[model samples]
Target: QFPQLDPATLAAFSAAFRGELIWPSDADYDEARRIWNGTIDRRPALIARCTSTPDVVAAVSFARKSGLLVAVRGGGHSMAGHSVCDGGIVIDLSLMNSIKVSRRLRRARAQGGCLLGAFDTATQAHMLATPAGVVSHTGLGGLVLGGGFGWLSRKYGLSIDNLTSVEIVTADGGVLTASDTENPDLFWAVRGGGGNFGVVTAFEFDLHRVGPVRFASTYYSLDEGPQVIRAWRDHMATAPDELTWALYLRLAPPLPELPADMHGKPVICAMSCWIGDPHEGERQLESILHAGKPHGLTKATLPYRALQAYSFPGAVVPDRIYTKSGYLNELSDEATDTVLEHAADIASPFTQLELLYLGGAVARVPDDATAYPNRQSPFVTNLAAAWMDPTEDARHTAWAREGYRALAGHLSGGYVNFMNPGEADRTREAYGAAKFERLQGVKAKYDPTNLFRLNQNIPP
Candidate 1:
């Protein structure tokens, strides 16, 4: 049990707070503490849901005065379950979700609690968008801070690339706006430094004109994995920036669109999204569609918002998940063979290997432009195992550990967005010496006492 705070102080804080204040004894306590990943079970001393920037500032100050451990929650989608902490106070931002778009300026200002789906829908209505992650449920705060990427990244760059400014609540409970001209150092550090600096209350992004997009998907039997991967790597090597592609080695889900006999069978699914003209996109995709003997194929022209909202089969259904992900300097022949070998040994049908093509705009950015690292790498990969039974945790975790270790030689470093709690040791390597030290300097200046230590920490 957590220690009780002074009654008078608690009462005063609750009265001053504008949003819901959930205590351990409150009826909503259990539901309030639940995050996206069911594997994470944390009981916070209190959950303060903020309604505005001032509410966030008030929550920060209260936690500091009470000497309570603090955790920040934005959509509660943190892969490492850092969104909630045991025996602490949680500053929940779920109620602060709001988005404003300026069609004339082609910009969007989104509240910290906003998810990718809301961000996409609001911006798409104006025929404007910014690069973000694939999952609609992912929090915009965590994704942008960790160098977000998606189908649009090859053309527009990572999410941080489009970020113009942010309003954040620092450790001292001070509200500050960061941009190129104001608090420039803090702005530089936040682009890819995770949440070590502070709790971001809002973000402003420069948007691009994006409306209808052409999409293509083709599936191949596992026996043809070698040919499919090699062809994909070569095609991506010369592909245009407007075309973004990803390859997945996963067991076929029971979708009505797929052949029933192939359900639950291992297959290679290669999908692409093209932002250019629909007709041209189809012509460019012919080579990819014929990469190997196809098991099934689907192509369509849809609104960019539709593509953003599409949840890939088996991706978001698992309540419990453990993942290992990193950057690959190159996808060599040996790397291809090793990837397929591990794909054949997955622990569960819910497990999958995801590979995304990176280059073009992503690589064009200067290495030191932001705190984000590994700009030289050409590909990013994730091995995620999503299962239900808690009793089988050891077996699933063991599979991920073995797979990650086997692929270490090919991995350049880990991506902070995809890193699980198990990969904490690689934090320094992921950011390298120069960037990690720079991040520490920023951390020292902003959060000298390190009140925000729950994230992928960059200690003061």
Candidate 2:
């Protein structure tokens, strides 16, 4: 077993790096421990803000040689808060945000620390984009590695599907590039295998011709929850490959953009995006709108990047966040009603129930094609509970738990990225037996000693 480092060793290690390092006594230590989810409060022995790929390599080498537990922080938005670890070392890559788009080749290379918002803004300037996660602040590292979902997914498939190559600093302290022809197994695993392989420094994505502007909007109504959700479930099953839709059971926030009377009301919100033919998109969405009477409709034609950043604005602040998510092979009428019932009685206004319409291009990919194994799931459900006060922790956790339990009968398995902090057993359930075994084999080959054991660890 490795003993804790002496002060002299710590100082020597810090001196070897050009980047900044923070310890427990440092003023920034507390802030560094804080992640997007306030639920986790882990304090590490050291936090190194890596400035370059060489920094990542050196950090990994030091951690392994020193027998120090190491964790990597990209955007630090993981629901499980795996970015930080207790009594270990953290390799923070927050400063490496950069994106390079090659318009002629229809591809873009993004630094691992880049946020979805930054990449979106850069690529959309050329009328090109790849599928990314919903929240703009989510790290490109975790999102692309774990199979991203977004407005562009239906048209382009998951983010991993569009991936061309990656520059990775592996467990052996070697920096290498993984692509279809080079280290092909590592390339396949990184697509959806989570962070068991190595620290990805840069990602190369194959871009598609996407809209500089697209038809997208959200419609909200109180009385039409059942009708809207059920009709949406069916409508999405047959929706054209170009259309992507999401159903949200949410409490309307008191925003100036919304009418005063709608504030603090529970509403069923339908968010839709169509990549082609605005008229056809509107007509298809109108059919769902006419199915039930809406209290308010926030529909419009807007920039694709704007729609991509719809959920998150500005930087993500530290707050108590509890989220549980799962895949649904099918959303029966009963399951839809169950979700609506829980939404109507949630204990906190901070809670939200979301149903993402999946399939089309996403399902067409074979199960074993990438590390993301849930190819057959037609829908994905997420329950999120958020609050600001420490006293509200129990209330938020219970709210998310109740919401998840209410819809349990319909769930096939959980998504690894969106899993709650305490649900370790469900990891295998999420990927299934065959995929999990294959992933384990890959993990053994690339990370035999499990040097990268921080994020949803795949044990060898």
Candidate 3:
């Protein structure tokens, strides 16, 4: 059995470390240990609020010496709640958040502790940004490492594609920087290998110039879903990469934008971002805007940063969130029908089905270039459930699983960032064997003991 560290031992260790080390008795311990997913109710033995790379090294080194399980919490957005441990140490990076951008060079170096909103705010100041995930409050560390996708993905590729270099503290407590020319193997591994190699302290990314985009979220009743979904599929098949979009199956909220007839009703949300000229975007989306004569439509030309905030509503609300995603080979007739049926039978009004378009700049990269190998997959489906009742776990979870099961045959693979603890058996499938073997070798080299096994773990 693993022996717990005594108070005297931890106090001596804390006196020597530079960061803020919180014990269970601390007033902020509960809030510090809690994560975004309300389902996670873990209690870490210690919380090391890191302020620098050296802090991360100290936390990992001390945890490793005591044979304690360690979890790294960034913006605390680990969907599976791997960012917090039940009886272990947590290296909390929430205090280390920082962002700096160079508009002249069109690049930015962001600390791992940063929320996606922090990065977007800094970059948008210069009208420059990188491809990150949809949720602004999401941590850049986990998102970039797990092949991040977002509104800008179709135009700029995933976040890994924009990552130019990184600074990390390995399992052995040594600090190293990985880039294209320096430690290139580690660079490739960290891009899509998840956080199994080490704790990333900062990320350097190549930025792209982006501005206000013509955006729309038009909702139509589910009665016209099948035909509209088919048309949306065909349109995305030939749509310009400059236009990134999604077709969401969700309940229409009782907002002023939605008519009273659409309140509390199931609807299809056709949302798009025109990264190019607003004029061109308006023309390109003209036909789809009129599809089904949506009962609720909110169209606007807003700053890319503003649009990012608008993209994911209620992200900060602490609710029990259960999300599972898989890469779809294509939108088949069978899959479409199942999606419609499941949308109508959701476990909660908050449950949503999103068939996100994935094949734009994402497929341009070579399949074996990084640990992420689902480049051939054209679309990805996200089955998400958000509710407040803890007792509803069994019901909501089963709903998501059944929905996934219905479309699993049509899925090519799963998204590691969106994976649950039960999906570890399919980690090989997500990595596509070739990438998984390569990742295994990297894991063997840097983390043979598997110090960072809390995430979508890659065993050596």
Candidate 4:
């Protein structure tokens, strides 16, 4: 029971709403409330599947009138479980997905509910694409709003850098269009502000011409991690922006590309993408292929969209996931040793550590251009703890947290999107003093009452 709204008011609101209104009694309630990270098991009082911007307005108005806690769900991939709340209203945009691409203009407009795959597919049809997170199943709304990047980022900049405008419904039920010119302040805020100010219905982005790319994954025994990572890092320091890569430390999964003897064994893997001439990519990538005595390797030329669809083990749904991520100023030997120490002692096979090489277009953007911060950091490290059983929750989570603490000396600031639930205290430090305050100004102007506070929040 909501405790605030009466039955008659609910019935009346339900009758006039255009989109589907789901209640706890609905047959699909359980499935509707489910999100990407299986660790989050919440039962909301109501789930509003908005089909358009007006439906979002009505849902916001209803939640306001009833004084109900509200959760805005895009792809339901919030690592911290912020996408769903217990005994409240979940304004779900999953049903509003629709995509349109303009090949002539080299641009795209995607509905907020759209996933990265949806945007990738529609844009790839015209041999064009935009920078976004690697996982295709992730939602465009949350990823863009919180600063998205992937294989293309080193050359194309982050997802927010390509974003031109957004159609948002704010806390006061006011609909507005935000861009560099119109509502520029709001535009700047939404780029890195998460979903604190409003619900975004659509996103407009400038796209780039992208086609076949060279993808490579090289695996080595765990003992080879330190030396290989050092060489890989050194090479990327001066590598062309057309190349982007990440270093992974985890147990090798059973893939046909690897020898059966190596399955379930800890290893160091270098996953990379080259977005230019095939000959040049091959030439530039040779330095990495021979960096370490590899146990196995796989290389191919494929559409960029195929690379986006590649999912890492345990990245999918129905798995208990917890993470601690931040930016690293440099991959000093001490930092390398710390990561190696953690990688060697794994509690669960699902756990992994990823160090994404950052720079090039992603860092070239002026610091003040958008609300996003930490653009100058050279690397971003993500420590993920994934498991299937509830009994192992404590062990897996502890591993991630302990490893994160060990790397504290090497970390400077944090990426807002990667901050898990318990990291709320780092909000201020993540953006630093000045930028954090600036974001607060934008929050005050739009959501003065903090009506939208479920995300990595900035108080009005």
Better of 3 and 4 by TM-score: 4
What are the Cα lDDT values of the candidates?
0.87, 0.81, 0.85, 0.88
Model 3: per-residue lDDT, tens digit, 1-460?
A: 2246767656656765788877788898887788888788878778889988877887888888777898988888887888998788888898888988999999999998999999999999999988888778899888889999898998889999989999999999999999989988889999888989999999999999888889888888999998889888888899899877788888876777788888768888888879888989888777678667776678889898988888655433638988878988788888999999988886456778888888888999998887776888989898888788899899988888989988888887788998875677878998887788889998999999999998888998
**Tens digits of lDDT, candidate 4, 260-318:** 99888888878887988877888777657877887668788889899898756444344
Question: Which predicted model would earn the best lDDT?
Answer: 4
Residue 182, model 1, lDDT: 100
Measured over all alpha carbons after superposition, the RMSD of each candidate to the real structure, in angstroms, is: 1.3, 2.4, 1.8, 1.5
Candidate 1 stretches greater than 4 Å from native = 314-316
lDDT of 2 by residue, 1-460 (tens): 2247767656656667777888888988899888888878888888888888888887887887777888899999888888998888888988889899999999999888899899999999998889998788889888788888888888779999999999999999899899999999888889888889999999999998776444444547657877777778778888888878787777776665567887778886667777777777777767666646655566777677888777732233538888888888888888877787778776555667888887988899988888897888988888887777898788778877987888888888677889767877787888888878888988988899999877776776
Error of 2 at 185 (Å): 1.4
Residue range 1-460, candidate 1, lDDT tens digits = 2677888777767777898888888898889898877789999988999999988988898888888889998878777888998888999988888999999999999999899999999999898999998888889988999899998899999999999999999999999999999999999999999889889999999999987888988788888989999988998998899888898888887777689998888888888878788888888876678778876677889888888877575544777888888899899998888889888877467788988888989999999999999988989878887788899888888777777788889998778988786666878999999999999999999999999987888888
Where in model 2 is the C-alpha error above 4 Å?
1-16, 312-318
The Cα RMSD in angstroms, rounded to one decimal, for candidate 1 relative to the true structure is: 1.3
TM-score of every prediction relative to native = 0.97, 0.94, 0.97, 0.97
Candidate 1: C-alpha lDDT: 0.87
Q: How much is the lDDT of residue 440 in candidate 1?
A: 93
Candidate 3: residue pairs that collide: none
